[PDB]
Amino acid sequence: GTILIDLSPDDKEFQSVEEEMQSTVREHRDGGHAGGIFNRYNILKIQKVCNKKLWERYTHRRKEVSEENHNHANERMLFHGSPFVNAIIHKGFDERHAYIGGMFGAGIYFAENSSKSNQYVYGIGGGTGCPVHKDRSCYICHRQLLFCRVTLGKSFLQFSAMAHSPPGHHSVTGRPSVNGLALAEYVIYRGEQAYPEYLITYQIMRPE
Numbered sequence: 001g002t003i004l005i006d007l008s009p010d011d012k013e014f015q016s017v018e019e020e021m022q023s024t025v026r027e028h029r030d031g032g033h034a035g036g037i038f039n040r041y042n043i044l045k046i047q048k049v050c051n052k053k054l055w056e057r058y059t060h061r062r063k064e065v066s067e068e069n070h071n072h073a074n075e076r077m078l079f080h081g082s083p084f085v086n087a088i089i090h091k092g093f094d095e096r097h098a099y100i101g102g103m104f105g106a107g108i109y110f111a112e113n114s115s116k117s118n119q120y121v122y123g124i125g126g127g128t129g130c131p132v133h134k135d136r137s138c139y140i141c142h143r144q145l146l147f148c149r150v151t152l153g154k155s156f157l158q159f160s161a162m163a164h165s166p167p168g169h170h171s172v173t174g175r176p177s178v179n180g181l182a183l184a185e186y187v188i189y190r191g192e193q194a195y196p197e198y199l200i201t202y203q204i205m206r207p208e
């Protein structure tokens with residue numbers, strides 16, 4: 001049921017999604033090991049992901065969360081990076097998209113920093129990099145990220161350097177506690193709490 005609609009670069013919606021992508025790049029403590037070395041992206045395409053069944057599944061769960069949290073879904077737009085982007089946009093987030101070994105347990109992880117999500121496009125730790133050149137810093141190969149609508153509800157705050165949310169919570173927030181420039185990361189434990197709104201196709205750009 002999924003259809004992908006291309007956004008024009010002239011469309012204010014393309015422009016606002018690109019700006020979120022570029023402006024949330026940071027440097028990473030791995031010196032670029034996982035995601036590559038870059039300060040910005042070449043955005044090749046932004047597509048809107050339309051699936052009525054998946055949207056309705058999202059909004060049903062969103063209303064449930066809202067009603068459990070004083071009518072406040074605490075909805076965010078966050079990035080997700082995964083080698084499984086094609087399954088996600090066709091069948092929704094589910095248990096197969098969980099990061100079993102994550103710092104906050106087996107859940108589906110999202111980031112404010114697009115460059116954090118970029119570290120996961122080719123697998124955990126960047127895997128072996130692009131399939132064509134086996135390069136985690138490949139500047140040729142097209143990469144994809146999702147920019148997603150995520151319901152956090154009441155989020156459990158973790159200060160830090162398939163499972164369940166903590167009792168009475170709907171998500172977990174990983175607050176950055178040493179790296180002063182890192183933005184927050186978030187984990188949900190139910191696939192229905194996220195909708196993959198935008199598919200962004202890009203390259204990382206080699207710094208000059």
Ligand SMILES: Cc1cc(NCCc2ccc(Cl)cc2)c2nncn2n1
Nearest residue numbers: 079080081082109110111117120124
């Ligand atoms: C920590 C973390 C993980 C992400 N994706 C994991 C995708 C995945 C899931 C399962 C296997 Cl096996 C490989 C890759 C992610 N995206 N944006 C921010 N994060 N943060």
Ligand code: NA
Nearest residue numbers: 164165170189
């Ligand atoms: Na939960």
Ligand SMILES: [Zn+2]
Nearest residue numbers: 130133138141
């Ligand atoms: Zn490559």
